[PDB]
Amino acid sequence: RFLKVKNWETDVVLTDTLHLKSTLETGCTEHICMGSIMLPTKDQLFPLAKEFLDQYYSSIKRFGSKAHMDRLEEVNKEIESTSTYQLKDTELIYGAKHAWRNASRCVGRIQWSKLQVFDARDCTTAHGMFNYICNHVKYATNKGNLRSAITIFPQRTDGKHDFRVWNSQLIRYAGYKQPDGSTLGDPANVQFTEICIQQGWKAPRGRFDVLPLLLQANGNDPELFQIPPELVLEVPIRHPKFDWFKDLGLKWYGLPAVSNMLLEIGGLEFSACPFSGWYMGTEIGVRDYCDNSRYNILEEVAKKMDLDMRKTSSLWKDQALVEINIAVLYSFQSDKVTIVDHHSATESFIKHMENEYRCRGGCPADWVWIVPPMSGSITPVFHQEMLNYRLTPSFEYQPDPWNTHVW
Amino acid sequence: RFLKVKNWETDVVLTDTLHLKSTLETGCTEHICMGSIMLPVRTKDQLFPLAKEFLDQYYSSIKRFGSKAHMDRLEEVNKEIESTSTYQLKDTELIYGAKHAWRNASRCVGRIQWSKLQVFDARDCTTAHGMFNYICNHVKYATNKGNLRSAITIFPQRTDGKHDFRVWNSQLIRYAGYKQPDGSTLGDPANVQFTEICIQQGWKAPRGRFDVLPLLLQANGNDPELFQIPPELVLEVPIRHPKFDWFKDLGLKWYGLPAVSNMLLEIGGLEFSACPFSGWYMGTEIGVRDYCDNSRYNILEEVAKKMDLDMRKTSSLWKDQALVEINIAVLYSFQSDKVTIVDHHSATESFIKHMENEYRCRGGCPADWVWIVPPMSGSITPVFHQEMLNYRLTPSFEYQPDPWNTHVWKG
Numbered sequence A: 001r002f003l004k005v006k007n008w009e010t011d012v013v014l015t016d017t018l019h020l021k022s023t024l025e026t027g028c029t030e031h032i033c034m035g036s037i038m039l040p041t042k043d044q045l046f047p048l049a050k051e052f053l054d055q056y057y058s059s060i061k062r063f064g065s066k067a068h069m070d071r072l073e074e075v076n077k078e079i080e081s082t083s084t085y086q087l088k089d090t091e092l093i094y095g096a097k098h099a100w101r102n103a104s105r106c107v108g109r110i111q112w113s114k115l116q117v118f119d120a121r122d123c124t125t126a127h128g129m130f131n132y133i134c135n136h137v138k139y140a141t142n143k144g145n146l147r148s149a150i151t152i153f154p155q156r157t158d159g160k161h162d163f164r165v166w167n168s169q170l171i172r173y174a175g176y177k178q179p180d181g182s183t184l185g186d187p188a189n190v191q192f193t194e195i196c197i198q199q200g201w202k203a204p205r206g207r208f209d210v211l212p213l214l215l216q217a218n219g220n221d222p223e224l225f226q227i228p229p230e231l232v233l234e235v236p237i238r239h240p241k242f243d244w245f246k247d248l249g250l251k252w253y254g255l256p257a258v259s260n261m262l263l264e265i266g267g268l269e270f271s272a273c274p275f276s277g278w279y280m281g282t283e284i285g286v287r288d289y290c291d292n293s294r295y296n297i298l299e300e301v302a303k304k305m306d307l308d309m310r311k312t313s314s315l316w317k318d319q320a321l322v323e324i325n326i327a328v329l330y331s332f333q334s335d336k337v338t339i340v341d342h343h344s345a346t347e348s349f350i351k352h353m354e355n356e357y358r359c360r361g362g363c364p365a366d367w368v369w370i371v372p373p374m375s376g377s378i379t380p381v382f383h384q385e386m387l388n389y390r391l392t393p394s395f396e397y398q399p400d401p402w403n404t405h406v407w
Numbered sequence B: 001r002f003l004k005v006k007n008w009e010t011d012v013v014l015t016d017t018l019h020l021k022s023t024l025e026t027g028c029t030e031h032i033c034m035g036s037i038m039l040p041v042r043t044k045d046q047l048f049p050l051a052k053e054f055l056d057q058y059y060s061s062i063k064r065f066g067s068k069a070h071m072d073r074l075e076e077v078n079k080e081i082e083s084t085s086t087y088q089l090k091d092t093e094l095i096y097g098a099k100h101a102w103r104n105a106s107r108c109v110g111r112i113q114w115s116k117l118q119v120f121d122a123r124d125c126t127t128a129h130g131m132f133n134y135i136c137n138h139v140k141y142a143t144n145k146g147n148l149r150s151a152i153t154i155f156p157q158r159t160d161g162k163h164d165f166r167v168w169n170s171q172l173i174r175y176a177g178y179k180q181p182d183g184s185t186l187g188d189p190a191n192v193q194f195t196e197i198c199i200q201q202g203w204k205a206p207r208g209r210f211d212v213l214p215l216l217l218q219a220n221g222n223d224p225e226l227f228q229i230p231p232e233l234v235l236e237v238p239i240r241h242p243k244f245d246w247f248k249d250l251g252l253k254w255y256g257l258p259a260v261s262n263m264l265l266e267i268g269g270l271e272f273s274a275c276p277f278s279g280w281y282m283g284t285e286i287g288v289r290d291y292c293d294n295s296r297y298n299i300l301e302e303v304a305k306k307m308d309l310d311m312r313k314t315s316s317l318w319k320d321q322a323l324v325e326i327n328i329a330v331l332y333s334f335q336s337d338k339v340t341i342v343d344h345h346s347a348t349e350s351f352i353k354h355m356e357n358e359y360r361c362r363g364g365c366p367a368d369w370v371w372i373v374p375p376m377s378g379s380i381t382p383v384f385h386q387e388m389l390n391y392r393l394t395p396s397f398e399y400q401p402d403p404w405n406t407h408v409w410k411g
Ligand code: HEM
Pocket: A100, A103, A105, A106, A107, A108, A109, A111, A115, A148, A149, A150, A261, A275, A276, A277, A278, A279, A280, A283, A287, A340, A345, A369, A395
């Protein structure tokens, strides 16, 4: 109701009032916290539309104005007649930026207002989708000087004509199960890769094969496209001190671009809304490379370092982890491809969070996600109490389409 | 109702039913998760159900539920509450209660050890002097010349809340902090306020970087009294690094025995406001938190300076590099001196095995991810990818206000 958050490093206490505007549910109850769980009609629509428009007109400082009332009137009439409504460009842009602003798991939200929004609501075919996506990819990549962007395809209508990007990210590497029983490439993408092979993709069967897009328009069966290779900026990974590091043959792609989430604005649902920023170093060096179920390279790196791997207490894992992360950042920097390390990113988030408290009355934040996956307590977010709640506009998870899709 | 948890590294799915037993509140609602918030006089009326439920659990665990002994104990405790407004636990119940508060402690990664806990019954203690003696005996027993043994000492329970036994120290063994006129701090900045209290009560402060604090002990709601733990009972480890010979010259040491002394133990509705308990350290408690927090000894810059890392940009990960070296040194020093310590890899692996075991035999293992995940290298530990459910079971350890804020001074 009126909540305080304390920073335990600095003693600064901040008061949250924004949470009272909270809308969706958390999964938690008074009896059980679920903070660590990864996934915890006309009648319905007008309230959601009114809520959004009220906050929109309030943000442009014309709350209660005739133009405010008129738009509410218009949308209400439009919903009655057509059972949906169309957002104005200005509303679409505002909504997309606020969905990011409200993303409680995102550490990079200091940037939220600088989002480039590409309106793809006029798209009608999977081929159209592919053209829009390549342009997003090229724009965002901008030769290594990355720019945040989102491309928004037509909204859900009757639920039978969804636009969807079947890929979880615009750029990702294939994974293949071997006769061996080992996995080649990215183990996270084994199932998606099979759907591609099944759909007729000619798989190169290497360790770092950029997956094709599988694009669905207007509820139709998805189609396969390959992103022009010259548009997929990649970075070979080397270490500033260890000359052998290059010989592991590691590379990663420069553009992180989530394509499987749903954007809800004013009760409208954009099932295809791929969005992108730039990487925090640990996403690649810690998660992508060191997860047991990902590229899982800790053991190999440690051996080339000649650490004592006999006992865990030598911290050989920790040593190799730091090195992999140094090499990631150094390789992106040397190639002039935007990257942020976890110190500077969390420091920025702490400044962002203070602005949001001061100017908005809060900043919903999921500590489990905001604290980096290594060196947690030496970053300023570790000692920062956070309140996690769900505001709208929002990015939401949605079911993988191959479980939903009738062919 | 069944709740499922998934491990994202292995895809293993467990099913929680134990959460059904949870009575106390979390802080969270349907609208707000308070999972990262650090901190989110009983009547006969409330007491009997609390007693009944404890005793039911106790008798189930000994396979005597519904027995004559069980029914007699309920009846006995009932009459005792109606007649005296409280009751006394049997020694077997006390031991059972204390083990379970630990088993239920959702923020503790060390719980695989819960059933091996030496319980010292100090319910006959009456004076601060008595407390001091019990506490010295705990420290010596638990220390065991380096081969650490878990223990808890339990002083008399709350009666009217005007006669509380309290240990004013937050931990039995801690280093003094001194705030200087130039705004810098000598020793441990976490213990500045308590140190000022000790001084005010008449402690002669050595004023060094690692001065072991006096005990400040309150018995029976009386004003607390100062005692110095015999120095020969306080095991300490000088910190050195296995390859960097200059590391010893940072002058660092730590004490071997972590012993929380400010928490409240609730068993069957009864409140044990003084119940110091100890185990052994996980290396990161000293090397990450105690040494590297900016509000603590804060040694990162000095260590990185000495390693001559590139400190001009955070993107060289100089902080991460010094952090690993400091932690290597803590583990190496404790091992070299034969003082029990566990690394965070081994400790988190043990906890996952413990957690899976608890799900099988108990139907759950409440766990607070924010606390269970170590403060460095989180995602290369097997707890990071483990979904957990946090809920409150009794018996439990609870927070209580620092006694200098509530104590009524006698004079
Ligand atoms: C500007 C560069 C950006 C950085 C450095 C950044 C950083 C991050 C990081 C580190 C995570 C957690 C992933 C992990 O560590 O495992 C995250 C999650 C998220 N980010 Fe940001 N981000 C950025 C841009 C964006 C943009 C432009 C949007 C939307 C327009 C966005 C929305 C999200 C969402 C919805 C999640 C949660 C993903 C999920 O729940 O699966 N991010 N981001």
